[PDB]
């Protein structure tokens, strides 16, 4: 499962954060800072895969804001990238032309979508339309 998934901007600002492992607040902040420094101190030809703390630290940002994942060394590396791409596509479909400004304003919506998509670091909605329909139904409830 994904130990922690956090969306951090190029400048270092974090637009999202979702850790599935209970860690101390100071320890979590230190881990996030180290991950940001590693991603911010890594080139574009590093394969987007880093083995930091025995965790598959996969960094793959399609825009100025980057995304990071932390999964155990028990599954294929391409699976994490595919899951990240699927989540990005689902978020773009739910919002519509998702940008950095919209992510900050839609932090609650992004957190709800992430919770409804992956729970506990594992994939919960394999399909892309079912999750979107469920999110829309939950939003329409009020």
């Amino acid at each position: 499962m994904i130990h922690f998934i956090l969306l951090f901007s190029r400048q270092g600002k974090l637009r999202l954060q979702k850790w599935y492992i209970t860690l101390p607040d100071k320890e979590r902040k230190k881990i996030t800072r180290e991950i940001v420094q590693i991603i911010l101190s890594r080139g574009h030809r590093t394969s987007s895969f880093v083995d930091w703390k025995e965790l598959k630290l996969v960094y793959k940002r399609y825009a100025s804001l980057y995304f990071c994942c932390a999964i155990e060394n028990q599954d294929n590396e391409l699976l994490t990238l595919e899951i990240v791409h699927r989540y990005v596509e689902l978020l773009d479909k739910y919002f519509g032309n998702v940008c950095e400004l919209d992510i900050i304003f839609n932090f609650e919506k992004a957190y709800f979508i992430l919770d409804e998509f992956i729970i506990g670091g594992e994939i919960q909605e394999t399909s892309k339309k079912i999750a979107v329909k469920a999110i829309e139904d939950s939003d329409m409830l009020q």
Partner: protein, 200 residues
């Protein structure tokens, strides 16, 4: 199954059902839902491959039942996209970690070698990880990639360089130890500050 081995026998009876489900999923290569990059239900396929690799890892009946499914997946899947490459890597890992046939092992070795020559950093890292995992298993077949392992140490990727160094360390035997000693010394002398201690 991973938590305790008592349910492995109980969970191993559903191997034909899982094989049939995987075959049905592979047959339906097109689907409006879960079909991304030409792969339908990539998460389901990855889960099925992981279950097959972890199911019957020390039994011949489980490997034999899933041998046909693994062979079909190893040849009926296209690795042009990232999902296909991940599925192929998962199938190769499951074949290596299970008591598969000689043909399945040869196909997995060929796939790993082909992915090693890929210029993609992620593909190279996946190939290096597969080679490191298949170090003890198919060790003689892993010796054909000694040049690739040596070249990976000089690669411009930190993860790729680390994977190449790990593969070289795990591939050191009682006959190539003397020959590989000079290469290891050269790598340690001209290695990164974070890898010099590891190389030593």
């Amino acid at each position: 199954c991973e938590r305790s081995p008592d349910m492995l026998a109980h969970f191993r009876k559903l191997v034909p059902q899982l094989v049939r489900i995987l075959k049905n999923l592979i047959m339906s290569g097109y689907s409006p839902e879960h079909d991304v990059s030409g792969i339908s239900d990539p998460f389901l396929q990855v889960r099925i491959l992981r279950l097959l690799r972890i199911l019957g890892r020390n039994d011949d009946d489980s490997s034999e039942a899933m041998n046909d499914i693994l062979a079909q997946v190893a040849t009926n899947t296209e690795t042009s996209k990232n999902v296909g490459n991940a599925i192929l890597y998962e199938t190769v890992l499951t074949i290596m970690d299970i008591k598969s046939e000689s043909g399945l092992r040869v196909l997995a070795i060929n796939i790993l070698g082909r992915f090693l020559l890929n210029n993609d950093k992620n593909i190279r890292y996946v190939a290096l990880t597969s080679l490191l995992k298949t170090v003890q298993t198919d060790h003689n077949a892993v010796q054909r990639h000694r040049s690739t392992i040596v070249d990976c140490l000089k690669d411009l990727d930190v993860s790729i360089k680390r994977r190449a160094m790990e593969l070289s360390f795990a591939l050191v035997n009682g006959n190539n130890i003397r020959g590989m000693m000079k290469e290891l010394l050269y790598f340690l002398d001209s290695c990164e500050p974070e890898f010099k201690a590891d190389c030593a």
